[PDB]
Amino acid sequence: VLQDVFLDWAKKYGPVVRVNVFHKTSVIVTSPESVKKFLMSTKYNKDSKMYRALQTVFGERLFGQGLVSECNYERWHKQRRVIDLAFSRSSLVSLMETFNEKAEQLVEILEAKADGQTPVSMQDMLTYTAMDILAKAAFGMETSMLLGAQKPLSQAVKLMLEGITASRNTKRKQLREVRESIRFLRQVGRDWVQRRREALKRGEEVPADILTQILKAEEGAQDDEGLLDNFVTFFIAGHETSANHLAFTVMELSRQPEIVARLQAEVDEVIGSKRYLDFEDLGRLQYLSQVLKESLRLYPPAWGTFRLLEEETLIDGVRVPGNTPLLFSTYVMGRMDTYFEDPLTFNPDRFGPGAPKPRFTYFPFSLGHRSCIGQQFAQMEVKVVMAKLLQRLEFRLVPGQRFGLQEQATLKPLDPVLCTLRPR
Ligand code: HEM
Numbered sequence: 001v002l003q004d005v006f007l008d009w010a011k012k013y014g015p016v017v018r019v020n021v022f023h024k025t026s027v028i029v030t031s032p033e034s035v036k037k038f039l040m041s042t043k044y045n046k047d048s049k050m051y052r053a054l055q056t057v058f059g060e061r062l063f064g065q066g067l068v069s070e071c072n073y074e075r076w077h078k079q080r081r082v083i084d085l086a087f088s089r090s091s092l093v094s095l096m097e098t099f100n101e102k103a104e105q106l107v108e109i110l111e112a113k114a115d116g117q118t119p120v121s122m123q124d125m126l127t128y129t130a131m132d133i134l135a136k137a138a139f140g141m142e143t144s145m146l147l148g149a150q151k152p153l154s155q156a157v158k159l160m161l162e163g164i165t166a167s168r169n170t171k172r173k174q175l176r177e178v179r180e181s182i183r184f185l186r187q188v189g190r191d192w193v194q195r196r197r198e199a200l201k202r203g204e205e206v207p208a209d210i211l212t213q214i215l216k217a218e219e220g221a222q223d224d225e226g227l228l229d230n231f232v233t234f235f236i237a238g239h240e241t242s243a244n245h246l247a248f249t250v251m252e253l254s255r256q257p258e259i260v261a262r263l264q265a266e267v268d269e270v271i272g273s274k275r276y277l278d279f280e281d282l283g284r285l286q287y288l289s290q291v292l293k294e295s296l297r298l299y300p301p302a303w304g305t306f307r308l309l310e311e312e313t314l315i316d317g318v319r320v321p322g323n324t325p326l327l328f329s330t331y332v333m334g335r336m337d338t339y340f341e342d343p344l345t346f347n348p349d350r351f352g353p354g355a356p357k358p359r360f361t362y363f364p365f366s367l368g369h370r371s372c373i374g375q376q377f378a379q380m381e382v383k384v385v386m387a388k389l390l391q392r393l394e395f396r397l398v399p400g401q402r403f404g405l406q407e408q409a410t411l412k413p414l415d416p417v418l419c420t421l422r423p424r
């Protein structure tokens, strides 16, 4: 795991280490005093050199200049202020119905296979769930991958992400398969953009969401190319890392029996046997919130971020040249024994009440102005999904499944989290 190499270099060579990342030179910064300085200021912005390859993948345009890949502060800020409207409190409150429908459906499908003998890929099951949640909450479209639909669309998503893995971490049938998949995603975008425009044209009123603001941001634009970039941006970002985070948690909780019981007890305490989980109930799931926090310390699907150091400056006694990308890693900091006592132990108590919150040593959703706009969206959906699983099902991991990480397009479980299921 490439990130695990950076960890050893940070522990051995100090808080300022020059590295090769995605065949580019960068400097890894691991002091929490330096994490604050660069991530908490508008002065420092993203380095276009590191995000450049994701904008266009294998000669085919992918993320473009969307909310993530746009490194120029001005172009990013204009669209951020518009897209922000889709992530308001009441905007996310209106998405609670969506979070609930999909979690409930996921559980029943798993409940029908719960015999304690039938292997079920939890990585796939959670991916479909995360995909269904996003497609509706963001675009008002149902993909129903959980019900076995949209098989070609999911394949394309997989291949695209493998194409990402081959692009930044460096045979012909794959190249052919990837190029088609990126077109497919953008073609779906065009179709879903046309469905909303036809709905608006025919007089219909549509509920405010993510799609509404990414259309609003590109108002008076010559073409829909920027809108597709933002469509791709959210289709991927709004399901992928949430799917991996869920998969990591389920995998780890298979070997944490004591933790599962208090999770169940809480689930029994606040949500009981109730089918629909309300918004006010989410904030009462404090221990679940803690367990998910620890899961993100050891297994952040997005390991960190890149800032551009424009002028040669001294960081922690080490002088770094200008035009250099600064690498920041919450994965690395999460596993260093100088920030976290006994780093490799899954201990949810780390984030308990009265316990000092990590000070610039833990940033799964990043920090500052370029932090995750979908943080609350994700935290809401993963509480809802996990709470329902804890209500209804007990999981036993299939013998032979490992507990490792694969550094792919994001960080995700090595094995697809195969489990035999049984009712609680
Ligand atoms: C466990 C869940 C997730 C994690 C850990 C995660 C991780 C992150 C991190 C670390 C960043 C910074 C990226 C960078 O600086 O290169 C980010 C930004 C982003 N996230 Fe998330 N995220 C998740 C959930 C979401 C979801 C559900 C959405 C979509 C609804 C979302 C959409 C975005 C977008 C569009 C950006 C760019 C924001 C901006 O720079 O203005 N993510 N994510």
Ligand SMILES: C[C@@H](c1ncncc1F)[C@](O)(Cn1cncn1)c1ccc(F)cc1F
Pocket: 051, 054, 055, 063, 068, 069, 164, 233, 236, 237, 238, 240, 241, 242, 301, 302, 372, 409, 410
């Ligand atoms: C994790 C990461 C990612 N996902 C899929 N392929 C490549 C990636 F880098 C992501 O940050 C998305 N993401 C953010 N919050 C949740 N998910 C991202 C970053 C830059 C980008 F140009 C596109 C992009 F999708």
